[PDB]
Amino acid sequence: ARVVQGSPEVPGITVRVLQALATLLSSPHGGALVMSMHRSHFLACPLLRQLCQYQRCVPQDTGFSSLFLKVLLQMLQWLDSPGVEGGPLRAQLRMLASQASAGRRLSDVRGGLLRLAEALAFRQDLEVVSSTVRAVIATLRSGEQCSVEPDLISKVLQGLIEVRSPHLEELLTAFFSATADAASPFPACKPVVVVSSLLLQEEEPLAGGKPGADGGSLEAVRLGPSSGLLVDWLEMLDPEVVSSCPDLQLRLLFSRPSFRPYLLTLFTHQSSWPTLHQCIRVLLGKSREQRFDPSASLDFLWACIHVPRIWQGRDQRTPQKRREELVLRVQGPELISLVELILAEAETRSQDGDT
Amino acid sequence: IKFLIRQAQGLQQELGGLHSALLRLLATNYPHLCIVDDWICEEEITGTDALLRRMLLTNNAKNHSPKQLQEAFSAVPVNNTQVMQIIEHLTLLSASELIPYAEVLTSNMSQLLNSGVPRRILQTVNKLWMVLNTVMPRRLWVMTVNALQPSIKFVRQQKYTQNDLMIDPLIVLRCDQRVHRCPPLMDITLHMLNGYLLASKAYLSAHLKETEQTREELKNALLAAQDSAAVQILLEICLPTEEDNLLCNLREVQCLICCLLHQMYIADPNIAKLVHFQGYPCELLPLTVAGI
Amino acid sequence: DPSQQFLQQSLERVYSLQHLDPQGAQELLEFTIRDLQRLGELQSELAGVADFSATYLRCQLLLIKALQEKLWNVAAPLYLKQSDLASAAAKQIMEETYKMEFMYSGVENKQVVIIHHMRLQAKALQLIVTARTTRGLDPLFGMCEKFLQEVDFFQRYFIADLPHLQDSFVDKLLDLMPRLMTSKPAEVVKILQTMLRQSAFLHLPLPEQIHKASATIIEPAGESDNPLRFTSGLVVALDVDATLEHVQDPQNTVKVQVLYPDGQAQMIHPKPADFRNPGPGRHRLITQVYLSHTAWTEACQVEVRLLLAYNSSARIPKCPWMEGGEMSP
Amino acid sequence: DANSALMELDKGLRSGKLGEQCEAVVRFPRLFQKYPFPILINSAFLKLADVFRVGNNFLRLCVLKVTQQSEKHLEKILNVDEFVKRIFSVIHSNDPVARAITLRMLGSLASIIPERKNAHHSIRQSLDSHDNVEVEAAVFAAANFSAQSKDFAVGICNKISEMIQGLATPVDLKLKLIPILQHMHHDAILASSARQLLQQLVTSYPSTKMVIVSLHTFTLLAASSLVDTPKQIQLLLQYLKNDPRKAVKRLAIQDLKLLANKTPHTWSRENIQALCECALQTPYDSLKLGMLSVLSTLSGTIAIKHYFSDLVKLAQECCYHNNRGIAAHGVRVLTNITVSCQEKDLLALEQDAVFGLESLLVLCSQDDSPGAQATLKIALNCMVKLAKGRPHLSQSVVETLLTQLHSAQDAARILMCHCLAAIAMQLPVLGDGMLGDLMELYKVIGRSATDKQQELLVSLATVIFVASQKALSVESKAVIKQQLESVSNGWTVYRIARQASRMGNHDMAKELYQSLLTQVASEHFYFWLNSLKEFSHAEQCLTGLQEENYSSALSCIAESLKFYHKGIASLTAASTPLNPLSFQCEFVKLRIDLLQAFSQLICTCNSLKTSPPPAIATTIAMTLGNDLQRCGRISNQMKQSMEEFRSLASRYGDLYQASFDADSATLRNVELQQQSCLLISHAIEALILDPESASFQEYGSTGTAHADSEYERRMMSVYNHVLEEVESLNRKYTPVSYMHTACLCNAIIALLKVPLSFQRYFFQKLQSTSIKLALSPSPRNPAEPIAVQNNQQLALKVEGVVQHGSKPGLFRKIQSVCLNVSSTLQSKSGQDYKIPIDNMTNEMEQRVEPHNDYFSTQFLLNFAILGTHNITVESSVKDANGIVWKTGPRTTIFV
């Protein structure tokens, strides 16, 4: 009954009130036959009939489907999408279904003003899900994403992000290390729903130093909510804090923000002893450049002296109050710079007063 | 037998006398497995347990077969970016899915402390060994003994299966000697040393019953001398160098050794007297008194 | 003041959201009662008004649950048993109104007239439940005339604030009562029932009221066995009671109940000479209690408790049930 | 018997024998479960404290595990001070493992000692100790003691704050210390301080695990302290809309789900609008699925009524999604909105509802996967709710169900049959319409089925019996043919016969019972099947009555009574001490007595014509008699019938409260039977006798649209007919019962129209609860009375424990046990009874409310009789709503 299938579909779409159950049963039988893969040559005929009915009537039919009978049209669209997703044999009826969905969307975007996305929402979602193709360049996508972000666009930015994610999931090529920071800053500034996925794709299989880029982003861009996410990238791909660049990490830890105590605890309980001693001797050294915050330096030193690994299982609180033996030895100029910065930072007195 | 003990203790409604008799036999035949500090960390603390397991195991822990971690360990890119997050994301398991990962964790602990390694990786390896000590601890101890080898290009004694290792636990103290400046590996070796000392005590107690088909005083003297030798070796490990004293791996290792010595003295108050009658260098006197 | 604004929001939510299904209203009342009880258990200075509102909402919930009983959905003249949950709920509602009226101190005339209207509605519900099962038509006249007499007494005692309350059960009954005095009590109680179903839900005004509770001072409080030595003939021993807090002149108002293990129960009257008030807002009750009974052959238990007094007669459980010493005679 | 076990455990614990000691310790919980007595539990806990005071550090862990396991048996300890002292005497040792075990033990005892200052000081001191396991044990004990003990909370909050903000502890220690702030709901100041601390921790420690644990603690505090729940919801929505991570989003989704599960009334319109706007901007599928699950949980409460247009658009958009779970959640939201809300345009949404159901039927028909069966069950129960809450669309769903029944490979037809049976319980026209299609499916289903043919056939037979009303046509023979040559599974045909007897079909029940009588693998089940067959035969013969017939009606009543006697005899022949049948015997006996009373009534109504007027007229003129109008010998028979009906109603009310385990259907059936009995009693009292006695008109509504069965509706219609025929003939004729006996007999025949309905409690007796009620009197092993001085006193010391063989919170919950006690004289004093007053004054009705599964009261009595007495006690458990629930333990002691 493939010849009268288009007529039956048109009758059920316009006014039948009875053929809806028959169409649903036929769609269910076709889906079951496609799942069983027992020579299910029925979906192609239904797809061709639907394409012919949409090509014959595209203005009044779409309006009647989006205004009068929306439930049956949405159910038929869902069944067609399920059949196209299950029966993936060389994507025979996939192109025709995509073309029909695009034609229906183009007809409903101008002729359906009152019923705004009432029944065409499923078709739009299916078209957006089917448009997630893979880029064939994987090198110039960063410039396109930056242009879309600068042009203040939402759908274009989402499409660019999806294309970049698909290119990253595909065969990795020589990625650029120039516009990646700008793209990350734009995605952090603008409301991006796939910002975490984009960051993971850009820092998963890139041929560059993602740690320096993440540090520069966290130090320059004012990312409010996503900052913590960057903090994750500071503890996932960077085991030691002072591992790649000491100056930038020292400036990020001790400066002239919000994630400061967490990173301080990480550097205290996750760094090796030579690196810790090096940081202590370079921080407490004689330097008037104000390259270290004493407010964090004091409790950093207090935590390094009271590391729980230094006191593993000895008796609790049994020292000699006359003189402490276990101490941290320092040098002359080191202690001089320490007392200098201590007496210097204790002169602000914004609201503390005198006591 | 430890996995069976755990899965029998997990079923307390049924299996009335079976689990009871199994535990009463484990407490007598295998005293080296009934160590309290070995399987006490599995108790609830604040309910935060299994929370990160239910909230951080859906998007990952699905394509991390042991072969991937194995090939990530040994490679020209010896960078610790991927292996770190890989070994960190699998710490949320229920200590029963780490059985295929135990073989990958072992045989690479000696290669771990080669040069320039971070601190979090060693801590995660120690935590994994601790959560893998609650199940199949004997095979894990054997694998860790066979993994921590001097690697001097010549094979002297290999694989230490169950006899040449449980007879004299001192083999756990003749390792690569590079783990002495490594707090996590040192704690692992101390746990193995205590377990193997208890296992040797049990083995001698069982062997003096399967013979002559006095000897008890000889066994007691041998056990006392073995404990004293272990304590002396642990004390000599606390020496600084061969030629800061507060902020270094030496401090943490000395503290762990003092903790193990305190546990041994609490277990038996006679080995302390025997060690003091044997004596040790004075450089360790202000450390043991203020540490034990 | 987060607690005050939260209480105001809860009260306005209970007041406004009332035109819905009966099950929805019931579950909303249950949720709000639980929330008010939690707030009273948590907050201290705002505990009195919270407990007052919680008790009022519990009264309303029990009322709306009694009105939705299956007896009206089944045959009326049968009334086999355990079919109307209002036969035992009317007494609870009356006790709750008595407690809300007498236990709290900072009450306003609006609260008094609202609680009297609630008591009248409870009496009408009791009348309906009794007439639903009463077989003799002669006793119906007696209780119907009694209820009309109570209604007349209420409307004579309360003259003001009547035009303030709109669409309420009291005003509807006052406007319809000139006609209900000419027919049979059967149709009278029928009209009373069909009117009380969707009458109204009056809003209660909050105030700075506080509860009236006691303490558990160590004077003859819970302790070890400590079996004292005494005989069966004369009195066993003497004990000391506990202190009081926010009782609004506990003199001639607070009783002391003694619940023996036997069926007998003694309520010793208070002594006005021992009531001390050096802590206005907090009190103290040091009164000797007399205990005596025949031999017990054991040291089972004893129960001493404090209660309240009313105009004619009633009791209020204020303090937690505190057991006394064994004192085996 | 428990004394011997305690003694042998003590002997095992005497010697060292570490293995034997561990064995005894791990066996102690079994002794606790076997004997919940307080004295034995106290002695065992004292022995555990003794073995905990001195040990080899391994018995301490076993005792800790035993204490953590047996937590409900912890409050029933008499000597608490000595136990706590023996437990705490080992925390002063220098062994960190011993101190950690002691801290964990103290934390396990945080429900019996929340004010011991020594434990608080120990936890405070050992919280910052130089260790690793002792610190964790101290944290555990601090959380336990901060749950209760507001003083410990206010004393430990500052220390927890400093220990977390000291930046000198590892990340794991902070992640373990954060959940301690959950138990800060004791005061408003504590809640505010914990809220500020958690806000500072979130704004200062940005990390996945850190933020997750801190948000969990914050939401647990907000849920346990319902003062700032709107702020919690606003913060969760802000983090859903701003935070780009995926773990935090799922955490917030589960958070909103828990909040809607526990406190759904605190939500507002703005929160729902924000959640819908956030779900509309989610490109992922799992996140949208979780948000829609939260929305479906919210829409099942008063939140959907307070919200009333973004939620409607979201539900309409996600109703036709590709995935199945999202579509199921969408159609659930739509069905809940349709049932709860009653807007004007929402009627059109009803269309989008029913067709939307199809979107959940063509995708989970032949999938054979739990992920599809879950959505199928969701859609089916949603359709059931829509059909039971709105009968306007009862056919528009049953037609889709019938059309979809043909599109399943014998996998989803069981669920469809369950849905059809659940829907057809309200309206019988659906069954009348779908009986033909059900029979067609039953005919075409007997071709081949191996996987689950049994359950499929059972469901088909059940839905057929529900749809049918008579089952006397060819359909019965067709079912018999389909069940005969097919697989003859005894359980399948037994369940089919049980469902047939439940729905009222007795011919098929009798046929299946006769077929099963020849294949029984035991003797008790043989008598059970024989009794069921006899009952079904008597039911079937009872339906052989004709309207306006009195000649053969007596013969039918006699043969039904004979079959009932045979059945009850064969049933009581199967009553054994192991699993005794108490409800069935009483139910059958009371039914037999009711039918015998009906037979006596019809016999008296027939004999009324046998010269009854001139019988008693020889002693007094019955005509125009103001004392006794129409005085005849029939008055004695009428009074006997009235008192018999009153006794039958009393026994029905007793059987209602004697079960305590029956379902709603069985209780409703018993209530309907008692109502019919009381109606017949009222008819024989007010109509046949003088109408001036009561003269009470039943001017009230009845038979509301709430019956969940056709039997209940038929009984209510018969009740209404009897009332409307008795309210008019009250003051019409003379009381000689000229036309009153006619309508009385018509009502009797109408009551016998519906044969019976054996409800669910008649079989598969579940929820077996029992109160032991093991008092502790003077030691009396023999039956000899306790020697008392007869003048001092006599104590009882009664105590009972509740035992539930099944799930306790299934149908009713035990709240109060109204213990009663009475005394009487055993030996005959002057008459056959005890005495003139029987000494039954000592009642002492006490009402104890057991918080746990244990209660103990004190009873006394005073008697001055030198003879032997009898003391009996009764449980009389009380439920939540409040019913006597007369239980039958019958614990009787002489003295």
From Swiss-Prot, chain A:
The modification Phosphoserine is found at residue 7. It is found in: Nucleus; Nucleus membrane. Belongs to the Integrator subunit 1 family. Component of the Integrator complex, composed of core subunits INTS1, INTS2, INTS3, INTS4, INTS5, INTS6, INTS7, INTS8, INTS9/RC74, INTS10, INTS11/CPSF3L, INTS12, INTS13, INTS14 and INTS15. The core complex associates with protein phosphatase 2A subunits PPP2CA and PPP2R1A, to form the Integrator-PP2A (INTAC) complex. Interacts with ESRRB, ESRRB is not a core component of the Integrator complex and this association is a bridge for the interaction with the multiprotein complex Integrator; attracts the transcriptional machinery. It is linked to Neurodevelopmental disorder with cataracts, poor growth, and dysmorphic facies: An autosomal recessive neurodevelopmental disorder characterized by severe global developmental delay with motor impairment, cognitive delays, absent or severely limited speech, dysmorphic features, hypotonia and cataracts. Component of the integrator complex, a multiprotein complex that terminates RNA polymerase II (Pol II) transcription in the promoter-proximal region of genes. This is Integrator complex subunit 1. It comes from Homo sapiens (Human). The gene is INTS1.
Curated annotation (Swiss-Prot), chain B:
Keywords: Cytoplasm, Membrane, Nucleus, Transmembrane, Transmembrane helix. It is found in: Nucleus; Nucleus membrane; Cytoplasm. Component of the Integrator complex, composed of core subunits INTS1, INTS2, INTS3, INTS4, INTS5, INTS6, INTS7, INTS8, INTS9/RC74, INTS10, INTS11/CPSF3L, INTS12, INTS13, INTS14 and INTS15. The core complex associates with protein phosphatase 2A subunits PPP2CA and PPP2R1A, to form the Integrator-PP2A (INTAC) complex. Belongs to the Integrator subunit 2 family. It comes from Homo sapiens (Human). GO terms for biological process: regulation of transcription elongation by RNA polymerase II; RNA polymerase II transcription initiation surveillance; snRNA 3'-end processing; snRNA processing. Its main location: nucleus. It comes from the Eukaryota. The chain holds residues 689 to 1032 of 1204 of the full protein. This is Integrator complex subunit 2. GO terms for cellular component: cytoplasm; INTAC complex; integrator complex; membrane; nuclear membrane; nucleoplasm; nucleus. The keyword Zinc does not apply. Component of the integrator complex, a multiprotein complex that terminates RNA polymerase II (Pol II) transcription in the promoter-proximal region of genes.
From Swiss-Prot, chain C:
There is a cross-link at residue 184 (Glycyl lysine isopeptide (Lys-Gly) (interchain with G-Cter in SUMO2)). There is a cross-link at residue 184 (Glycyl lysine isopeptide (Lys-Gly) (interchain with G-Cter in SUMO1)). It comes from the Eukaryota. It is found in: Nucleus; Cytoplasm. Component of the integrator complex, a multiprotein complex that terminates RNA polymerase II (Pol II) transcription in the promoter-proximal region of genes. Component of the Integrator complex, composed of core subunits INTS1, INTS2, INTS3, INTS4, INTS5, INTS6, INTS7, INTS8, INTS9/RC74, INTS10, INTS11/CPSF3L, INTS12, INTS13, INTS14 and INTS15. The core complex associates with protein phosphatase 2A subunits PPP2CA and PPP2R1A, to form the Integrator-PP2A (INTAC) complex. INTS4 is part of the RNA endonuclease subcomplex, composed of INTS4, INTS9, INTS11 and inositol hexakisphosphate (InsP6). Interacts with BRAT1; interaction is required for the assembly of the RNA endonuclease subcomplex. Belongs to the Integrator subunit 4 family. This is Integrator complex subunit 4. It comes from Homo sapiens (Human). The gene is INTS4. The chain holds residues 608 to 936 of 963 of the full protein.
From Swiss-Prot, chain D:
The modification Phosphoserine is found at residue 776. It is found in: Nucleus; Chromosome; Cytoplasm. One of its GO terms (cellular component) is cytoplasm. Signal peptide: none annotated. It comes from the Eukaryota. GO terms for biological process: cellular response to ionizing radiation; DNA damage checkpoint signaling; regulation of transcription elongation by RNA polymerase II; RNA polymerase II transcription initiation surveillance; snRNA 3'-end processing; snRNA processing. Its main location: nucleus. Transmembrane segments: none annotated. InterPro entries: ARM-type_fold, INTS7, INTS7_C, INTS7_HB, INTS7_N. Keywords: Chromosome, Cytoplasm, DNA damage, Nucleus, Phosphoprotein. Component of the integrator complex, a multiprotein complex that terminates RNA polymerase II (Pol II) transcription in the promoter-proximal region of genes. Belongs to the Integrator subunit 7 family. Component of the Integrator complex, composed of core subunits INTS1, INTS2, INTS3, INTS4, INTS5, INTS6, INTS7, INTS8, INTS9/RC74, INTS10, INTS11/CPSF3L, INTS12, INTS13, INTS14 and INTS15. The core complex associates with protein phosphatase 2A subunits PPP2CA and PPP2R1A, to form the Integrator-PP2A (INTAC) complex. Interacts with NABP2. This is Integrator complex subunit 7. The gene is INTS7.
